[PDB]
Structure 1
Amino acid sequence: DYSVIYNFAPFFAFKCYGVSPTKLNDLCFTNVYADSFVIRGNEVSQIAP
């Protein structure tokens, strides 16, 4: 359920690279992996393929 995710604060950067920001709830995933960290503002652009 992504209702709480979308109900959290507005996001500076929300990019989905492979799936659709909106269709993430009709698809069944396999392993899911969550990685949480704090970085500077300009270093967000470095976290991309």
Structure 2
Amino acid sequence: AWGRMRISDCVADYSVLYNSTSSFSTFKCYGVSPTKLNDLCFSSVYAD
């Protein structure tokens, strides 16, 4: 029984995750490259 949520009307920089947040053992992207997530805009985003 997993959740889902929708994120909208917001600005997202991943550098904020660097300060005080725990590291990430797995970080894998398929349709995009991680080096180009700071220069894009997405029509819709969903989080599971």
What is the TM-score of this pair, normalised by structure 2? 0.58
The AA in structure 1 aligned to 2:23 is P
**Larger relative contact order, structure 1 or 2 (CA cutoff 8 Å, min sep 6):** 2
What is the TM-score of this pair, normalised by structure 1? 0.57
Shift of 1:30: 1.0
Structure 1: gaps of 5 or more residues = 36-49
Quote the RMSD (CA, aligned, Å).
1.2
CA distance in 2, matches of 1:9, 1:21: 18
Ranges of 4+ aligned residues in structure 1 off by more than 3 Å: none
Residue identity over aligned pairs, in percent, reads: 74
CA distance in 2, matches of 1:22, 1:10: 18
Listed as ranges, the matches of 1:1-49 within 5 Å are 1-5=13-17, 7=18, 8-35=21-48
Q: Secondary structure at the match of 1:22?
A: helix
Structure 2: gaps of 5 or more residues = 1-12
